[PDB]
């Protein structure tokens, strides 16, 4: 039987590079948005400044049921230093213009994320959500923001 919890294409490449963008990226061009795929081997995504107004954005191109998000940090291949997001908020949109921060109850959902730079932490949405665009918005981090990502659900 089919279950709506399959990887949507970060690791597989089904989500093409052009579908992945960010608010900003670190100025040396060694931590680009396209380095944010789960199990990516060369660093990860890092914004130009570490702040809670930065985000990594995925355009799924079609309305898609989203059921879970997995994240990693990353180890710098230059320094061996580890960076990871400890918590984040999710922003979603059907059209790329009207954005809503994901809530559980009256308040924004704060997802607890990584506690090292290497392991995958999976968070399920409290209900499946029909969306086209996804933004991961780091709120807290260790040493600095670095992300690798997979999205889970199913194409409706």
């Amino acid at each position: 039987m089919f279950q709506c919890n399959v990887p949507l294409g970060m690791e597989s490449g089904r989500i093409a590079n052009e579908q992945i963008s960010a608010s900003s990226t670190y100025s040396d061009g060694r931590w680009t948005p396209q380095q944010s795929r789960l199990h990516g081997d060369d660093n990860g995504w890092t914004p130009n400044l570490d702040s809670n107004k930065e985000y990594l954005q995925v355009d799924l191109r079609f309305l898609t049921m989203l059921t879970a998000i997995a994240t990693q940090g990353a180890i710098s291949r230059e320094t061996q230093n580890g960076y990871y997001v400890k918590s984040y908020k999710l922003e979603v949109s059907t059209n790329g213009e009207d954005w809503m921060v994901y809530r559980h109850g009256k308040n924004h959902k704060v997802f607890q994320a990584n506690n090292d730079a290497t392991e995958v932490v999976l968070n399920k949405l409290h209900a499946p959500l029909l969306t086209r665009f996804v933004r991961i918005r780091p709120q807290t981090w260790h040493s600095g923001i670095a992300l690798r990502l997979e999205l889970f659900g199913c194409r409706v």
């Binding site: 670190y26 040396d28 060694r30 890092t46 230059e78 320094t79 230093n81 960076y83």
Partner: peptide
């Protein structure tokens, strides 16, 4: 900017 530094190298991380």
């Amino acid at each position: 900017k530094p190298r991380r």
